[PDB]
Amino acid sequence: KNVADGLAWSYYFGYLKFVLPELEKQIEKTSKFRSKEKFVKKMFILIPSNCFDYDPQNRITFEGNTEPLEKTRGGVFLRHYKHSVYEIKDGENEPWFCIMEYATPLLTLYDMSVAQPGELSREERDAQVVVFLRKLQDILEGDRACQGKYELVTFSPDRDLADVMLRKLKDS
Amino acid sequence: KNVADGLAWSYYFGYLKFVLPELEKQIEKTSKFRSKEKFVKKMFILIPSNCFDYDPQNRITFEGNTEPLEKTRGGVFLRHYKHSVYEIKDGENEPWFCIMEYATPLLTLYDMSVAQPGELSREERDAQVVVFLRKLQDILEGDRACQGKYELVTFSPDRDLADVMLRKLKDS
Ligand SMILES: [Ca+2]
Ligand SMILES: [Ca+2]
Ligand SMILES: [Ca+2]
Ligand SMILES: [Ca+2]
């Protein structure tokens, strides 16, 4: 029922609340990318459809991670928040540098329903997913510090990851 | 209602599923701690009570993090999972080295109810919390690979953090 709200409220208060309003800053701390033009300074939250290698042609490549985001809690607990920047080759053209995130709260809905159907039907989850994605927007859409600092991207086997991502970069 | 299950099912499939059965291994990869006895190789999930400095006497200290756990998914997405090891001073006696985690799915219930009461009441949440802790156990309690690799610890202002942790280490 209204549990997809709890997952979306946890993806925000526990992650996107403080990594999004500092994304630009943190990216401007990583030397290897500061003077690297054609780097869309925005977090792309990637959403897969259906069920189970998104890189056949091998256009995408891990190029490192941004400077961690030291956040201490309660005056004792330290936690680092870094992001993985990838390089997407546009044929012979210049390559692109983006930040992609494989959404964990959503993936745990796929993983669960494949391992615990009784608790989460593959269909009962399909409703929980559509609510999560639409709830996640309405939360961020109401946060000025996180506004325009992200983008939701959906792909599939027929929707090649490298292709769809290159499409989103020309319009960002 | 039955949403706390979704939070507990996401903390497992998205984190505890693969960091817990490898904790011992990862800790035995971090040079600074391999030859360091009095290091309880177990993850302590810390739970705070009520609402808002857990270190007055300053007995606890960040001593670094374990070797990250590179986990790639879909053949493209890289993600690092490290843990923060702290040093708890046992008076003039030898010091202890443990792994403490400030639980993210639970903290998002506290943070939320302070910022969005209408969506999550202080009481409606207090139920969601007690269910989460009881749900999280039965999931881990049913996974032999995660069994005995963790421990739930609860504290409060009257329950000094450095103090409560030292009793849990001597009783392991
Ligand atoms: Ca330059
Ligand atoms: Ca690749
Ligand atoms: Ca030694
Ligand atoms: Ca301290």
UniProtKB/Swiss-Prot annotation, chains A, B:
Cytoplasmic side: 1-172
Amino acids binding 3',3'-c-di-GMP: 15, 73, 79, 101-104
Residues reported in the UniProt entry to bind 2',3'-cGAMP: 15, 73, 79-80, 104
Compartment list: Endoplasmic reticulum membrane
Membership in a protein family: Belongs to the TMEM173 family.
Function according to Swiss-Prot or TrEMBL: Sensor of cytosolic DNA from bacteria and viruses that promotes autophagy. Acts by recognizing and binding cyclic GMP-AMP (cGAMP), a messenger produced by CGAS in response to DNA in the cytosol. Following cGAMP-binding, promotes the formation of autophagosomes, leading to target cytosolic DNA for degradation by the lysosome. Exhibits guanine base-specific ligand recognition. Binds 3'-3'linked cGAMP, 2'-3' linked cGAMP and 3'-3' linked c-di-GMP with much greater affinity as compared to 3'-3' linked c-di-AMP.
Subunit details: Homodimer.
Protein's recorded name: Stimulator of interferon genes protein
